[PDB]
Ligand binder design. Structure first.
Ligand SMILES: *[C@@H]1O[C@H](CO)[C@@H](O[C@@H]2O[C@H](CO)[C@@H](O)[C@H](O)[C@H]2NC(C)=O)[C@H](O)[C@H]1NC(C)=O
Ligand SMILES: CC(C)CCC[C@@H](C)[C@H]1CC[C@H]2[C@@H]3CC=C4C[C@@H](O)CC[C@]4(C)[C@H]3CC[C@]12C
Ligand SMILES: *[C@@H]1O[C@H](CO)[C@@H](O)[C@H](O)[C@H]1NC(C)=O
Ligand SMILES: [K+]
Ligand SMILES: [Mg+2]
Ligand SMILES: [Tl+]
Ligand SMILES: [Tl+]
Lengths: 268, 39, 992
């Protein structure tokens, strides 16, 4: 033929069949032992998610949400993702004492449901009403963005203490139980309005620590609705929403490390 | 610890780099020694 | 074009002096007119040689920039700029990826260009050396007056004059001469002075006395002649053009390189476009379809391989430089290993090029002297009183002297003023009797008759050094038979005795044997003149026989020859044991050529020519079956009337071939004949008459000390110490480097698979990219470099000089067996070890292997800063990318770790590491430096930006260890099978 005879062509096939078969069987074996060394409830390493990311619902083309108020299908793209998220926080999804629980309607302290063990059933998560998100189809004019803190197993988000000076200096400082979120731009051509649990501009600490998908399915993380009823129009406004805390840090590279990058433009 | 389990989300990449560079250097020296056993 | 120049020349030495003038419109006495000479100048053109048109270095460099790998790397470099252009227009990408990768790849092509350019070097100044043989000026007779003119202004027809010490300015018809002798070594390779006279003495113009040639010099006397040829039209000017004009051609090693380039280029374009369409079918945007292709290019092309080859060659050439063997062309480092036939000059190559005493006949006994340079033999006789009598004649009846200031150099190497035979005798006595000058001071010469054409003897009368005599001793030497007709007694073991027919017959026997050995034989005799008949003041007349020259005492015979170099016989046998055929090709006479052939082992003992059979059986040569003769001796005059097909039959039908009295073109023809049969041929030589053959040879080797400038220009290799044993070393080195290149190539190729497979699974699996493009270049250009080179220092696995020369048609540098092992077996194991570490990194950070399938869509989505892992955690864009790049880093390090084992297995093709050992210090160096480089690239701060290399945790380093070990075991088991059964299965499938 090309290389060899039929007899040789066969033998080279019988070899590579057994050979690659063995190699596949060995590869699988090493994957088995790897998995055997891992927990079902907690990942081996968490230093790469460490400082929590802050992500929002409006799917930004490039950290930007520009549209026209005087146009219907101009914002119907951002309403798709906005709906996708809030559709999960339905009351019909949170039914019965299992696996949900009614928690303080005001920001409270942490809740420990034991260890990362299966020695108990599904760890009961705090309910969250999308109805706590006042004012927010969504904002056809002047968007109503929804913030979110990235989930990390066993992470206890710790707010800053009012020992020294603060950006939003001491205003509504629920020091003990709220992780604040203050959006900014100089360039003050807007109108910041925050909505959340208990009416505070933060995340209620009663939703922590997260026990993971395996030990807490259907779990709901707290949301923080933000509305920009800015009196300006037809210009790119670089708005940055920042979260503050002891366990919260940022990076010049990762522009989502505990903060937002939104470029709103109501070009109408 | 409980709420004070910050060490869980931390890794000393600084020491690791110091050690890694020490090792790389020493392996580089060892190599020169064996090569220079006759030039 | 040059087929005309490969033919024997035609001449006009047969014409009379007068007749020759009519042909050139010339005067025998007055010479040409100033006007007629200038007319002929413009007519024929200058008496000069024009160098052939060369290829500029520009075109030579750029021709390498387009050879398979460079072509693919160019397509990659441009395709980078393509994707970059498409980006800069569509979505403003502030990145530098495609732009920088395009710059990097273009640089890789340029630098790789320098390496191949360095390897494909051609240092040739043939025509320049020939031009150096035309004198600046010549002496001509114009308008009846002699004047010096620019030799280029010399034309056919003018009257030229030459004298001892000057170069022949052009081909001349001798019309007048006085004691003129010439050095025709340019045409023959033999430096013994040849007389020139107006008389025609041979039909063959290269042998007649009435022609003098350009490229030669007058050694003594004076001559006048008419110019018959000028410039390019001279006999050796044509040889110049032939030699300078010959097409170089591709070396065996070069052909091998191009061959695997086709193979690897083939699989590259195959998988390249095979997966380019496979991606579009899967619905991949052309934006991405090209990005994957660039990666495929980089994965398939072994970027550092061609440069490795060059370095391995260079390092092999450095070792040979250290044995006095200079390599002018890097590729010639290997040709000697692939050589199946050596065509060797005799004089100054196989031989020392110096008349040396070989045997002596005295006391009715043949004695043998030591002919070797360094005198590696033993003594023959010292005791016999006869010896001292013969020794005295050899010293006294000799007019040769050592040049001043030689006392530093060895006797046999020092320059001597005199003819070759007298120099030989001088050096013979000086060696075994001490200072000859002393013997010539103790015995003052009073009268002598120098060797005469008519007398055929030379005699001398000396004052006997003996005090009790202080009388007159007569000594003489000459033609053995002439000396015999002048002897009455023979000095036997001390005492004289009558010359009976018995001893006279033993003389003839001794004389015939020595002459049969191709040796020049001389007779020696002396006579102690009677005291009473010769007073202390008796005057001797040299002009008229004033003393007896008959009834003298015969002392002995001495024989001489230009002997082989000490190392030559043994080197010839070694070449022949390696299955190399050795042919002699010489301008010298057949009797001498044949005798040295037997001396060095070109013709082995018992082997006969058709002429030998005929003489032994006493039958006509036509009655001899030519197939009964394995040896042959072909004279150039017969070679001339043979067609190439008939020359091919001679080459095919004889194992032991001697081509004697060959012209320079004839040497070229014999070389081409050998090549025509499909053989790789080496030429060894030292003369300008070797230049065409040296050029045409697959590899020409010139002698460094004895070699002429031309020969060393025509060669690929120079033996700087004239050590013929270096050929044996050269062939051995050549074979070793050929095997080691295979090892180094397999090693380099093996790591291609773990660079290809990640890109494929990236498409078919939709997982995060396991390894990057930049990461690949860190391997092929970084870590693999020193290890790959180090394989050039591997010792032989067996006695390579015991095997036959490779068949260049069947035995390839890269075959299917190499690809099967490198691509199908070892590289495949490396790929898995890479993937394993990849799955380990991701799974330990929260992305278990199961959830990875079909996630790249969301993984690469720059706007999704919340991807969910297996544990329910959310990752930003840059966070998961850090883990991904850490995966690239550990995959990279996995390659390094699996290349550890590969380096050790590529060490040997057959033998076990437990047999060959670990005595390669460069290889061990490679292991340490490779690992140092990898660690540095991972842990050095800032490398995460320039190369996207991230620090690895200690446990990460050990992921591929079990795969590294399986490689070592697998290959060790496999080679154990090879050795345990030379049959073929494992052998014919995987044996590189
Ligand atoms: C989650 O809540 C949303 C609230 O808008 C539900 O949307 C409803 O969709 C139905 C049918 O398309 C409409 O008739 C209603 O007007 C919507 N709102 C309400 C309050 O009922 C959505 O269907 C819910 N999703 C799930 C899975 O239950
Ligand atoms: C990533 C995976 C799926 C690709 C696997 C490719 C396999 C099938 C390839 C890789 C190397 C290949 C072999 C390389 C060498 C030879 C020897 C030659 O004389 C005949 C073909 C043969 C035997 C090839 C057959 C196919 C082969 C085994
Ligand atoms: C939000 O909606 C409420 C009614 O639910 C209305 O009273 C109020 O004006 C709205 N706020 C703004 C800022 O438009
Ligand atoms: K050559
Ligand atoms: Mg010679
Ligand atoms: Tl490569
Ligand atoms: Tl490679």
């Amino acid at each position: 033929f090309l290389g060899r005879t039929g007899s040789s062509w066969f033998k080279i096939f019988l070899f590579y069949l057994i050979f690659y078969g063995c190699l596949a069987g060995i590869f699988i074996g090493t994957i088995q032992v790897l998995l055997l060394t891992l927990s079902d409830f907690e990942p081996k390493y968490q230093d790469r998610v460490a400082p929590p990311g802050l992500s929002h619902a409006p799917y930004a083309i490039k950290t930007e949400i520009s549209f026209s108020i005087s146009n219907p299908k101009s914002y119907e793209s951002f309403v798709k993702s906005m709906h996708k998220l809030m559709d999960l926080y339905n009351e019909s999804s949170q039914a019965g004492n299992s696996p949900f629980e009614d928690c303080s309607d005001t920001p409270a302290d942490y809740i420990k449901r034991g260890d990362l063990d299966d020695s108990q059933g599904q760890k009961k998560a705090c309910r969250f009403s999308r109805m706590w998100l006042k004012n927010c189809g969504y904002a056809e004019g002047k968007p109503c963005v929804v913030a979110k803190l990235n989930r990390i197993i066993g992470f206890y988000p710790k707010p800053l203490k009012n020992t020294t000076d603060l950006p939003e200096e001491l205003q509504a400082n629920y020091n003990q139980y709220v992780l604040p979120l203050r959006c900014a731009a100089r360039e003050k051509i807007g109108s910041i309005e925050y909505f959340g649990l208990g009416g505070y501009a933060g995340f209620p600490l009663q939703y922590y620590p997260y026990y993971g998908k395996r030990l807490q399915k259907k779990y709901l993380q707290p949301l923080l609705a933000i509305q920009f009823t800015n009196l300006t129009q037809n210009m790119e406004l670089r708005i940055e929403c920042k979260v503050y805390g002891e366990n919260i840090d940022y990076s010049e590279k990762d522009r989502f490390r505990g903060r937002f990058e939104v470029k709103i433009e109501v070009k109408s | 610890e409980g709420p004070d389990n910050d060490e869980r989300f931390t890794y000393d990449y600084y020491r690791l780099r110091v050690v890694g560079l020490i090792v790389a250097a020493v392996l580089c020296v060892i190599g020169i020694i064996i090569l220079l056993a006759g030039k | 074009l040059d087929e005309l120049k490969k033919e024997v020349s035609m001449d006009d030495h047969k014409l009379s002096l007068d007749e020759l003038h009519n042909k050139y419109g010339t005067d025998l006495t007055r010479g040409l007119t100033n006007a007629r000479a200038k007319e002929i100048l413009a007519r024929d053109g200058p008496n000069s040689l024009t160098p052939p048109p060369t290829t500029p270095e520009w075109i030579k460099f750029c021709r390498q920039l387009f050879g398979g790998f460079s072509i693919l790397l160019w397509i990659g470099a441009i395709l980078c700029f393509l994707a970059y252009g498409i980006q800069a227009a569509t979505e403003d990408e502030p990145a530098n990826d495609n732009l920088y990768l395009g710059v990097v790849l273009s640089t890789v092509v340029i630098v790789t260009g320098c390496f191949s350019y360095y390897q494909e070097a051609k240092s040739s100044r043939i025509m320049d050396s020939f031009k150096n043989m035309v004198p600046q000026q010549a002496l001509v007779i114009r308008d009846g007056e002699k004047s010096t003119i620019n030799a280029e202004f010399v034309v056919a027809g003018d009257l030229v004059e030459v004298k001892g010490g000057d170069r022949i300015p052009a081909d001349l018809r001798i019309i007048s001469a006085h004691g003129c002798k010439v050095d025709n070594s340019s045409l023959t390779g033999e430096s013994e002075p040849q007389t020139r006279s107006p008389e025609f003495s041979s039909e063959n113009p290269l042998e007649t006395r009435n022609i003098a040639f350009f490229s030669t010099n007058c050694v003594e006397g004076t001559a006048r002649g008419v110019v018959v040829y000028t410039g390019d039209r001279t006999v050796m000017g044509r040889i110049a053009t032939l030699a300078s004009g010959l097409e170089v051609g591709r070396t065996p090693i070069a052909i091998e390189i191009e061959h695997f380039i086709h193979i690897i280029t083939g699989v590259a374009v195959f998988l390249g476009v095979s997966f380019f369409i496979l991606s579009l079918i899967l619905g991949y945007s052309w934006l991405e379809a090209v990005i994957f292709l660039i990666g495929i290019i980089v994965a398939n092309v072994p970027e550092g391989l061609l440069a490795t080859v060059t370095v391995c060659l260079t390092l092999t050439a450095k070792r040979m430089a250290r044995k006095n063997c200079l390599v002018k062309n890097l590729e010639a480092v290997e040709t000697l290993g692939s050589t199946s036939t050596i065509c060797s000059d005799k004089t100054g190559t196989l031989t020392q090029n110096r008349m040396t005493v070989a045997h002596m006949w005295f006391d009715n006994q043949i004695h043998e002297a030591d002919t070797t340079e360094n005198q590696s033999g033993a003594a023959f006789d010292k005791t016999s009183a006869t010896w001292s009598a013969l020794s005295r004649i050899a010293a006294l009846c000799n007019r040769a002297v050592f040049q001043a200031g030689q006392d530093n150099v060895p006797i046999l190497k020092r320059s001597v003023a005199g003819d070759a035979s007298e120099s030989a005798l001088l050096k013979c006595i000086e060696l075994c009797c001490g200072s000859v000058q002393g013997m010539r001071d103790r015995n003052p010469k009073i009268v002598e008759i120098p060797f005469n054409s008519t007398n055929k003897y030379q005699l001398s009368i000396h004052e006997n050094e003996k005090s009790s005599e202080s009388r007159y001793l007569l000594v003489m030497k000459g033609a053995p038979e002439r000396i015999l007709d002048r002897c009455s007694t023979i000095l036997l073991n001390g005492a004289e005795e009558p010359l009976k027919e018995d001893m006279k017959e033993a003389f003839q026997n001794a004389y015939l044997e020595l002459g049969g050995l191709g040796e020049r034989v001389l007779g020696f005799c002396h006579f102690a003149l009677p005291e009473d008949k010769y007073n202390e003041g008796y005057p001797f007349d040299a002009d008229e026989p004033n003393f007896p020259t008959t009834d003298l005492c015969f002392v002995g015979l001495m024989a001489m020859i230009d002997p082989p170099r000490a190392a030559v016989p043994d080197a010839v046998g070694k070449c022949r044991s390696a299955g190399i055929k050795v042919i002699m090709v010489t301008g010298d006479h057949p009797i001498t050529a044949k005798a040295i052939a037997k001396g060095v082992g070109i013709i082995s003992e018992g082997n006969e020519t058709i002429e030998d059979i005929a003489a032994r059986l006493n039958i006509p040569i036509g009655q001899v079956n030519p197939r009964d003769a394995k040896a042959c001796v072909v004279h150039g005059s017969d070679l001339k009337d043979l067609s190439t097909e008939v020359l091919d039959d001679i080459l095919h039908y004889h194992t032991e071939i001697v081509f004697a009295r060959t012209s320079p073109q004839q040497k070229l023809i014999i070389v081409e004949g050998c090549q025509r049969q499909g053989a790789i041929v080496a030429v060894t030589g030292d003369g300008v008459n070797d230049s065409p053959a040296l050029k045409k040879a697959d590899i020409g080797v010139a002698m460094g000390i004895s070699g002429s400038d031309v020969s060393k220009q025509a060669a690929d290799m120079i033996l700087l110490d004239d050590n013929f044993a270096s050929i044996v070393t050269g062939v051995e080195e050549g074979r070793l480097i050929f095997d080691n290149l295979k090892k180094s190539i397999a090693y380099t190729l093996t790591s291609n698979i773990p660079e290809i497979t990640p890109f494929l699974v990236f498409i078919i699996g939709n997982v995060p990219l396991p390894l990057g493009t930049v990461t690949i270049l860190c391997i092929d250009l970084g870590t693999d470099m020193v290890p790959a080179i180090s394989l050039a220092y591997e010792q032989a696995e067996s006695d390579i000089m015991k095997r036959q020369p490779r068949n260049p048609k069947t035995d390839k540098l890269v075959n299917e067996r190499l690809i099967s092992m490198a691509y199908g077996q070892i590289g495949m194991i490396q790929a898995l070890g890479g993937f394993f570490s990849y799955f380990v990194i991701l799974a330990e950070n929260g992305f278990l292997p199961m959830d990875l399938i079909g996630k790249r869509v969301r993984w690469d989505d720059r706007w999704i800063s919340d991807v969910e892992d297996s544990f329910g955690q959310q990752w930003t864009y840059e966070q998961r990318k850090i883990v991904e790049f850490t995966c690239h880093t550990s995959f990279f390090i996995s390659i390094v770790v699996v290349q550890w084992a590969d380096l050790i297995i590529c060490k040997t093709r057959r033998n076990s590491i437990f047999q060959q050992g670990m005595k390669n210090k460069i290889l061990i160096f490679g292991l340490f430096e490779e690992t140092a480089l990898a660690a540095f690239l991972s842990y050095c701060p800032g490398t995460d930006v320039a190369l996207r290399m991230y620090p690895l945790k200690p446990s990460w380093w050990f992921c591929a260890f079990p795969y590294s070990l399986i490689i070592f075991l697998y290959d060790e088991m496999r080679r154990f099978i090879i050795r345990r059964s030379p049959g073929g299965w494992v052998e014919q499938e995987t044996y590189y």
